[PDB]
Amino acid sequence: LWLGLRAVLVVAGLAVLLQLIRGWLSSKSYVFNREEIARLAKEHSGLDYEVAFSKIIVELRKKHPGHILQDEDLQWVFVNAGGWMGSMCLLHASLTEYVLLFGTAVDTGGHSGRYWAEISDTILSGTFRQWKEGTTKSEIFYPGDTIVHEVGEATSVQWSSGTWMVEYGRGFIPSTLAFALADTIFSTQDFLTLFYTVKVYSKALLLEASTHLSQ
Amino acid sequence: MALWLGLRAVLVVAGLAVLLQLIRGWLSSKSYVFNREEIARLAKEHSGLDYEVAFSKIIVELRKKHPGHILQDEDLQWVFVNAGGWMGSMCLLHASLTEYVLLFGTAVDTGGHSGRYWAEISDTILSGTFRQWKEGTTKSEIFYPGDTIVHEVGEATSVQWSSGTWMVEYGRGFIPSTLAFALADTIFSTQDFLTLFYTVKVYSKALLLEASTHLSQ
Amino acid sequence: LWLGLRAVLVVAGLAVLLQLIRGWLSSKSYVFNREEIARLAKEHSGLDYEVAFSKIIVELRKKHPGHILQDEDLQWVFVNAGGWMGSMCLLHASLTEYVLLFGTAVDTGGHSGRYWAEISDTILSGTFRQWKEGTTKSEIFYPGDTIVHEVGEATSVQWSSGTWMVEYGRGFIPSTLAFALADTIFSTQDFLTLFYTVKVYSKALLLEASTHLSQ
Numbered sequence A, C: 001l002w003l004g005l006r007a008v009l010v011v012a013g014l015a016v017l018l019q020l021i022r023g024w025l026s027s028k029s030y031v032f033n034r035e036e037i038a039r040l041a042k043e044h045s046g047l048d049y050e051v052a053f054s055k056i057i058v059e060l061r062k063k064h065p066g067h068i069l070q071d072e073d074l075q076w077v078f079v080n081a082g083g084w085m086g087s088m089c090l091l092h093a094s095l096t097e098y099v100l101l102f103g104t105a106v107d108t109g110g111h112s113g114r115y116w117a118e119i120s121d122t123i124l125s126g127t128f129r130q131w132k133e134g135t136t137k138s139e140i141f142y143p144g145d146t147i148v149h150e151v152g153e154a155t156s157v158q159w160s161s162g163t164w165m166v167e168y169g170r171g172f173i174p175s176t177l178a179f180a181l182a183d184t185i186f187s188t189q190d191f192l193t194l195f196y197t198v199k200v201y202s203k204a205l206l207l208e209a210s211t212h213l214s215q
Numbered sequence B: 001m002a003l004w005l006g007l008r009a010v011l012v013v014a015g016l017a018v019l020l021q022l023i024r025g026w027l028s029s030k031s032y033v034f035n036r037e038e039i040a041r042l043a044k045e046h047s048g049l050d051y052e053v054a055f056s057k058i059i060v061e062l063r064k065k066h067p068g069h070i071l072q073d074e075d076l077q078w079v080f081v082n083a084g085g086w087m088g089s090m091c092l093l094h095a096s097l098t099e100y101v102l103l104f105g106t107a108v109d110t111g112g113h114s115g116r117y118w119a120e121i122s123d124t125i126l127s128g129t130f131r132q133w134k135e136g137t138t139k140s141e142i143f144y145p146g147d148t149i150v151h152e153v154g155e156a157t158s159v160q161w162s163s164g165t166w167m168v169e170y171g172r173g174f175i176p177s178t179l180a181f182a183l184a185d186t187i188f189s190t191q192d193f194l195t196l197f198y199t200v201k202v203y204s205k206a207l208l209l210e211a212s213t214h215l216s217q
């Protein structure tokens, strides 16, 4: 039964880690909230998305100091996943939450991805077409609306050539990195972008670790 | 004995050569259930109604003229399909080792590679638009409800669909050869393994139903 | 430290092979130049791109005999990379240069790819949307314009259903085939197109080598 030792060790490891992480998510104090980020974006969902980005980043650093990356650690990184292409401006990220500014300047679309995280996007500009699984009709969302991509749900997304939004996710963030980097490995082969994504995600983790040490 | 390093290589070449003649001889001596004109005619008769109403009447007509070969309503579900760079959904009605009939379409604007496989495929558009770009050309053609696109064996084209395109599709050949292309984006791009499970689920039910019909006959 | 011998040989092998190629590219006599191809393509940037294809091939074979493939060795080969799909007509190709006619008859777009080659495209018809890295707005280019994709640059490309262009690239051409065939391996699995791409690239390499033997 020695050959089965490896198979038992992974099943026991996955079952223990599944209860360890799920019990952590149900007992962890969270920094941001899905309604908090959506409300913040709706305050400026009339202005220019560049003007909205500035006022949103300023308001986030006031209400949650020590949790948003500095302007020195901010950069627009391309994101290739599920067949669509966009760019992100990661403001905050931990092992359980993340807040970023996502959007695209071209017409893209594809698979939303199925992972262990609840994702909410509040559109600031452009349009957002969503196709839920098992249906034959899609819905188009406009600036001001908030789309909630629930955990375990898989939909089809599509954006116009000027769509920008504010996004908040909660769950187990590392579970999404397999889907977020799939097209970067097998399609674009833009390993420099792969480096940028790990770079800014590590800075957000080190910043979050630095805040817990001071408290 | 130089045949030791070549033992795996010869067995695969011998295995492929034996399997190639056994499958191609089967396709030339097997009685087929459906017909390429039969599915296309049935879909074109309902290409003026709403595609949801057309789906219902086509499934009824298929179960009337071909009982025991179309899945029951309990075993039907819309499964996402990501392949060649496009994304849609299918409703597998019938499928065997040599034929398959399903309802495919998309609610978004997608497009990509049609895939090159060992199966002749015909699609009759019920709604939306269908742009096809054949290999070796510099211009594309747009197909409208009522038209039928024939994707011959070994042909590779570029496909593109509008945000409301739905169609009835029939394929004949060696169906397992197409599953390698149908699941490529599901493995390397979307990683939606639950959809991968659904595809294997609905394709197995169609095989078990078709096998269940052969046992009673 | 015995197992680190392979790792040192790889670091020394990659660093030395980088110096030899980069120093070769910076001191090598080239056949074509981007301004030569750009002027030739801009003169024929009209509506009838098929007539433009013929007139460009004739002019290229006059001023550069023995460097452009004959009509017998020409075929339109599909190109799937970065999420977009088009077709190419390889006219000239070496280890450092290539001249081809690229375009698409459908609406595609995706990652431009980051590789070791400077690429310039002069639009003959259609439209070309380029989304530079780190920005939030994209630009649309029209027939007559020339887009220069420099080495190490990564952008988002998008084309309309009638875009055709003349392209010239210079750098390390074998480094670009890894990106050009990525989607063909992991998405389309069109092994026949993979054969066509290697076939026409081999004929173009053998043609360029055949001219060096006669000279």
Ligand SMILES: O=C(OCCN1CCOCC1)C1(c2ccccc2)CCCCC1
Pocket: A079, A081, A088, A098, A100, A102, A112, A113, A119, A121, A149, A157, A167, A169, A173, A176, A179, A180, A197, A201
């Ligand atoms: O930044 C992202 O992409 C937002 C776009 N959204 C739009 C629709 O819902 C899913 C993704 C993701 C990320 C990237 C990098 C770090 C952490 C997260 C979010 C997880 C899924 C994709 C990659």
Ligand SMILES: O=C(OCCN1CCOCC1)C1(c2ccccc2)CCCCC1
Pocket: B081, B083, B090, B100, B102, B104, B114, B115, B121, B123, B151, B159, B169, B171, B178, B179, B181, B182, B199, B203
């Ligand atoms: O369900 C499909 O996709 C329909 C779309 N049509 C549209 C364009 O031409 C090819 C397929 C396919 C399938 C997948 C799995 C089982 C049975 C069939 C058909 C074969 C080629 C792709 C995958």
Ligand SMILES: O=C(OCCN1CCOCC1)C1(c2ccccc2)CCCCC1
Pocket: C079, C081, C088, C098, C100, C102, C112, C113, C119, C121, C149, C157, C167, C169, C173, C176, C177, C179, C180, C197, C201
């Ligand atoms: O032929 C091509 O594709 C042109 C399309 N362009 C359009 C935008 O910029 C990058 C590619 C490429 C090639 C393929 C085969 C041989 C030599 C070159 C050029 C390098 C990058 C992709 C593949």
Ligand SMILES: CCCCCCCCO[C@@H]1O[C@H](CO)[C@@H](O)[C@H](O)[C@H]1O
Pocket: A161, A162, C127, C128, C129, C137, C138, C140, C158, C159, C160
């Ligand atoms: C590649 C083909 C694109 C079609 C050209 C017309 C539309 C492109 O124009 C786009 O319109 C949007 C507002 O409407 C803007 O947000 C985009 O920045 C602009 O590029």
Ligand SMILES: [Au+]
Pocket: A074, A075, A076, A088, A089, A090
């Ligand atoms: Au930024």
Ligand SMILES: [Au+]
Pocket: A053, A074, A089, A101
């Ligand atoms: Au920003």
Ligand SMILES: [Au+]
Pocket: B076, B077, B078, B090, B091, B092
């Ligand atoms: Au269904």
Ligand SMILES: [Au+]
Pocket: B055, B076, B091, B103
């Ligand atoms: Au159905």
Ligand SMILES: [Au+]
Pocket: C074, C075, C076, C088, C089, C090
């Ligand atoms: Au050609």
Ligand SMILES: [Au+]
Pocket: C053, C074, C089, C101
């Ligand atoms: Au040509």
